[PDB]
Amino acid sequence: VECPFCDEVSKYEKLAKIGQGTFGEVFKARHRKTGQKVALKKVLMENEKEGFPITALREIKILQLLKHENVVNLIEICRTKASPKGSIYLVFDFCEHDLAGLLSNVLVKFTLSEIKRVMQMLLNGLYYIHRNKILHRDMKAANVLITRDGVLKLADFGLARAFSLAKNSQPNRYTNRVVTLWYRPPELLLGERDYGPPIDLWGAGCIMAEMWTRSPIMQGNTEQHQLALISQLCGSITPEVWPNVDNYELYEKLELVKGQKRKVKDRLKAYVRDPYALDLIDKLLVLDPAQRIDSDDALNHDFFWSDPMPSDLKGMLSTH
Amino acid sequence: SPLFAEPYKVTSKEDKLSSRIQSMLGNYDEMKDFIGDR
Amino acid sequence: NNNKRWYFTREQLENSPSRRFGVDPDKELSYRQQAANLLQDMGQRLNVSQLTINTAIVYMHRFYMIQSFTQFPGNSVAPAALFLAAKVEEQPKKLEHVIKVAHTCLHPQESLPDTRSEAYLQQVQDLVILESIILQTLGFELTIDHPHTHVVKCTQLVRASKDLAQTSYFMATNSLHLTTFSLQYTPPVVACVCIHLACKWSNWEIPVSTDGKHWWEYVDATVTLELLDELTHEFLQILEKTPNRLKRIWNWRACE
Amino acid sequence: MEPVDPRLEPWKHPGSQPKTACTNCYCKKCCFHCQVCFITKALGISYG
Ligand SMILES: [Y+3]
Ligand SMILES: [Y+3]
Ligand SMILES: [Y+3]
Ligand SMILES: [Y+3]
Ligand SMILES: [Y+3]
Ligand SMILES: [Y+3]
Ligand SMILES: [Y+3]
Ligand SMILES: [Y+3]
Ligand SMILES: [Zn+2]
Ligand SMILES: [Zn+2]
């Protein structure tokens, strides 16, 4: 069975296992001939039902479209000769760290100037993916990569999809359950199915605050718990701040969480310090997605035009 | 002003290509309205 | 060549996998047309977009550039291709529903084996498998561009009539069914051929642009008149080779 | 056989199922009913 366009994974030598996932999940590797370091992600198929997971097909279809500096790059898709099963692997350019790990390590240090560039790179990635009608849908520290050279990359488009620029007609019915709990926007937690770019931007805000807090700022145990935390931080969700939020079937479930005052800047004050930084985190963590700032305008916020301007990430990456 | 004038009928022909496509599908003005739902 | 990977010249097509196992050039052309036929039919029954159908038709045309009709029958691949195309074009149909529709089209009299029979559960496997084989053979290149896109866009830019614009889109679909143009010319060019063709059937002449450029020069740069007439000729050749029935019922009656 | 706005995102596309059932007639009219009818009836191509 010829397969001129689907090279066998063997061409890659598994150098090590990335993180602690499944047996043969993510693998670091070297091209047996160029020595090229690449990351091997197996298309996990426990979703053995309807054939090749559509969710996978999307990731791949999307990865091959998005070709931008701040977007992880898909090299090729390899296979493993099958018999009693067959597997498929995605070959990515290997990336040294993830924002999750760097912030976890009590050792790594960031200068306001350095954060500013991490952010400016994140938002630039988003703006690109969003301008190509693509929603990430899985925003979180762990999926924000940084290379040895200090370049940011948005990763894991396994839950990503296209979206429609339909200011026009009929509302869109996109998949509601998406985005890890801790980085999920209110709209989704209320059942929203006609969301768009603003969901990634709410993650962008949860992340930005992490650069200073060094850990997820809202860690709910349940979806209602999450909503409670969000309320305690961004304020009670009411039609006052969220025009027409009443209509959400699930809203009638917030009844008891109704008195919080927006404490965003206050609670993050002790960590951020910088004013404009407190400002953009405040504008990204806006309850009504329609009033929430977008990638473009975030990229033109004073936080990106005021001393200290953005500097590379050599310092932070200080030999290790 | 528009970039293109409107298409105009050129039925004065000695065009083998047209004759051929005609003998295959039939007269366009006749069939034309059956093509599709609308 | 990555942009040229799935494009072949007349000679290259002159020798396909199928040919290798002794399948006459024409024999293959029919297997292709027939596959298109079943794909379109199953498509309308599953009621997926014509976009999905077009996509599957190409997956199928490219597929038979690597694999042979001898080892993979059209009636087996078609259902898998469509099932895939449906997921790619974001209008996914459940595996069962496709299986059923296929059974219906291929076995009109018989009845849908029990969703518990080995006969059924067996093809659910065969389909899922042919799927992964289809994916691997296309080298996971799922995004397809069809002439339709350029046909619509162009007919609008030349203030083409309503039905002329419709006839045009109609040919674009016939090019995917009746020919291998999707393996020889880029969509933009096909679209030009489709339009050129319709105007020939309807005596519509598209005047030169107020800037001097011909209409097609706004679709693709590589297109020329010579090209248009040549390809239109081949498309007619293909049409004239089908056992074209119309030529006989062409005039006598209508109906209710 | 029925033009669609290229600008439309894939999932926004309309089904391909013609608006009216396909008859058993083989006339100029029914021969252009839909794609399937044109291919099978007018041209005489079939997968069975
Ligand atoms: Y994930
Ligand atoms: Y109330
Ligand atoms: Y804006
Ligand atoms: Y007029
Ligand atoms: Y008409
Ligand atoms: Y019409
Ligand atoms: Y009409
Ligand atoms: Y010839
Ligand atoms: Zn009739
Ligand atoms: Zn019909």
Side-chain angles (χ1 to χ4, degrees), chain A residues 147-163:
Chain A
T147 66
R148 193 165 113 290
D149 277 8
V151 185
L152 176 138
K153 312 273 192 182
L154 281 158
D156 183 20
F157 289 27
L159 181 48
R161 71 160 301 148
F163 72 79

Side-chain angles (χ1 to χ4, degrees), chain A residues 135-193:
Chain A
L135 303 191
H136 190 266
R137 305 206 291 174
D138 195 17
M139 294 296 290
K140 63 174 166 184
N143 290 310
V144 183
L145 313 183
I146 311 186
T147 66
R148 193 165 113 290
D149 277 8
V151 185
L152 176 138
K153 312 273 192 182
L154 281 158
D156 183 20
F157 289 27
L159 181 48
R161 71 160 301 148
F163 72 79
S164 191
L165 293 172
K167 289 187 180 186
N168 300 306
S169 60
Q170 265 64 299
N172 311 272
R173 251 195 162 185
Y174 304 140
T175 304
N176 174 222
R177 172 151 255 284
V178 292
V179 168
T180 324
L181 177 58
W182 296 344
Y183 297 92
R184 203 179 287 133
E187 59 245 58
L188 293 194
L189 289 175
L190 288 182
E192 183 53 36
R193 290 197 44 184

Side-chain angles (χ1 to χ4, degrees), chain C residues 10 230 233-234 237 241:
Chain C
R10 186 192 108 309
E230 176 182 58
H233 164 74
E234 293 305 313
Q237 290 210 291
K241 242 190 294 168

Side-chain angles (χ1 to χ4, degrees), chain B residues 32-33 38, chain C residues 162-163 166:
Chain B
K32 147 182 56 186
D33 294 81
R38 289 155 71 124
Chain C
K162 259 298 186 277
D163 294 274
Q166 189 172 56

Side-chain angles (χ1 to χ4, degrees), chain D residues 5 15 19 34 38 43 46:
Chain D
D5 183 24
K19 290 302 175 179
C34 61
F38 169 63
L43 296 182
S46 57

